Design a protein around this ligand. Sequence first.
Ligand SMILES: *[C@@H]1O[C@H](CO)[C@@H](O[C@@H]2O[C@H](CO)[C@@H](O)[C@H](O)[C@H]2NC(C)=O)[C@H](O)[C@H]1NC(C)=O
Lengths: 49, 49
Amino acid sequence: DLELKKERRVILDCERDKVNDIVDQVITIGKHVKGYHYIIANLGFTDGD
Amino acid sequence: DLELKKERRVILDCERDKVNDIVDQVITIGKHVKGYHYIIANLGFTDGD
Ligand SMILES: *[C@@H]1O[C@H](CO)[C@@H](O[C@@H]2O[C@H](CO)[C@@H](O)[C@H](O)[C@H]2NC(C)=O)[C@H](O)[C@H]1NC(C)=O
């Protein structure tokens, strides 16, 4: 549904558990290619894999 | 190094073990995006994940 508007910039605002699920979903879909930018809005950045 | 020749079609000819590692490496480097075509040269295609 986000692909209809051609939106490349995504901002993630969740805890240390949902961010891993979103990352795994992006990996399975294939959105981590050069041309995107994610923002993990949380106090911890290196906590997740 | 393969990206230098601008080659997108890759033919995989390995057992049921190396193909999984190659698929995992492709997933990690983000080459499974639309625009590539892989060929698994083996009798068992549904065997691997
Ligand atoms: C399947 O992957 C191949 C690899 O690019 C593509 O199929 C090509 O399909 C187009 C569309 O019919 C043809 O014009 C080409 O001749 C095909 N062969 C190539 C490009 O080598 C396509 O990206 C994918 N989908 C289909 C339906 O083939």
